[PDB]
């Protein structure tokens, strides 16, 4: 179906401990495929998925050069942000960026992104029009003015509508074995008595790809949103993900509860019950 490519930059200052560290990771959907760390012994863009190893040396050189220039760029960005926020050079600060494109089943651009953060807060973001900016505050408005004058949005848009979708289409083809395979969750419900009159029903989803999933408990067909313990979807470390949802239920009422599972890998949503 639809697919995404995203690059994630983290630039972290560390006064007294060297120049700011710059890290990039690239994903297609929920699959990491490339990394860069300025603290590496000989920093370069490195493959993290088999299907990207196909790319010739020129790709790796070009990609490495971008990241190496970014290390210097984001060091300047950090220095600039200190001035814009009247901050001292004693503190550690973080700039983040996430950019990329979403394509439809036909590979056409659905939408592009380019968002920046400072110390975990929105700073500036390219609007969906790929022509204009939303600045979060008066400091980011200064960047906005510079970027407007420098036609940054036009360069972003050229990338988002061109290379971003073109390279993502190629990655999807090269990695079709995996990037175009959904793995459905393996599911079950466990039962643990809490006390004589309360029991925990826990609905498990394991081994699924991609990470998007919905797990919900209903009591008598009514969603138990407020009473469900839902953990964050978590990486198993073999590309797949795990999640569970739990409710505490009155003893003897277990059968009034149903677990509902939606996942792209499932032909239809699943209903599970405690199977004593």
């Amino acid at each position: 179906g639809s697919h995404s490519m995203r690059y994630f930059y983290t630039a972290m200052s560390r006064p007294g401990r060297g120049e700011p560290r710059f890290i990039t990771v690239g994903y297609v959907d929920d699959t990491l495929f490339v990394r860069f760390d300025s603290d590496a012994t000989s920093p370069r863009k490195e493959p993290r998925a088999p299907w990207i190893e196909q790319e010739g040396p020129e790709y790796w050189d070009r990609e490495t050069q971008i990241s190496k220039t970014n290390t210097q760029t984001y060091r300047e960005n950090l220095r600039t942000a200190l001035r814009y926020y009247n901050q001292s050079e004693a503190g550690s600060h973080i700039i983040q960026r996430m950019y990329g494109c979403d394509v439809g089943p036909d590979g056409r651009l659905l939408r592009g992104y380019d968002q920046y953060a400072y110390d975990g807060k929105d700073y500036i973001a390219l609007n969906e029009d790929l022509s204009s900016w939303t600045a979060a505050d008066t400091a980011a408005q200064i960047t906005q003015r510079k970027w407007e004058a420098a036609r940054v949005a036009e360069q972003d848009r050229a990338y988002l509508e061109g290379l971003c979708v073109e390279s993502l289409r190629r990655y999807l083809e090269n990695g079709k074995e995996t990037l175009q395979r959904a793995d459905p969750p393996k599911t079950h419900v466990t039962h643990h008595p809490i006390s004589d009159h309360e029991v925990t029903l826990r609905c498990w989803a394991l081994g699924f790809y991609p990470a998007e999933i919905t797990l919900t408990w209903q009591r008598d067909g009514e969603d138990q949103t407020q009473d469900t313990e839902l953990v964050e979807t978590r990486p198993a470390g073999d590309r797949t993900f795990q999640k569970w949802a739990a409710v505490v239920v009155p003893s003897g009422e277990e059968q009034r509860y149903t677990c509902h599972v939606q996942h792209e890998g499932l032909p239809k949503p699943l209903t599970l019950r405690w199977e004593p």
Partner: peptide, 9 residues
């Protein structure tokens, strides 16, 4: 693939 956005803040 990335592209180089070289304009600073």
């Amino acid at each position: 693939e990335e592209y180089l956005q070289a304009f600073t803040y």
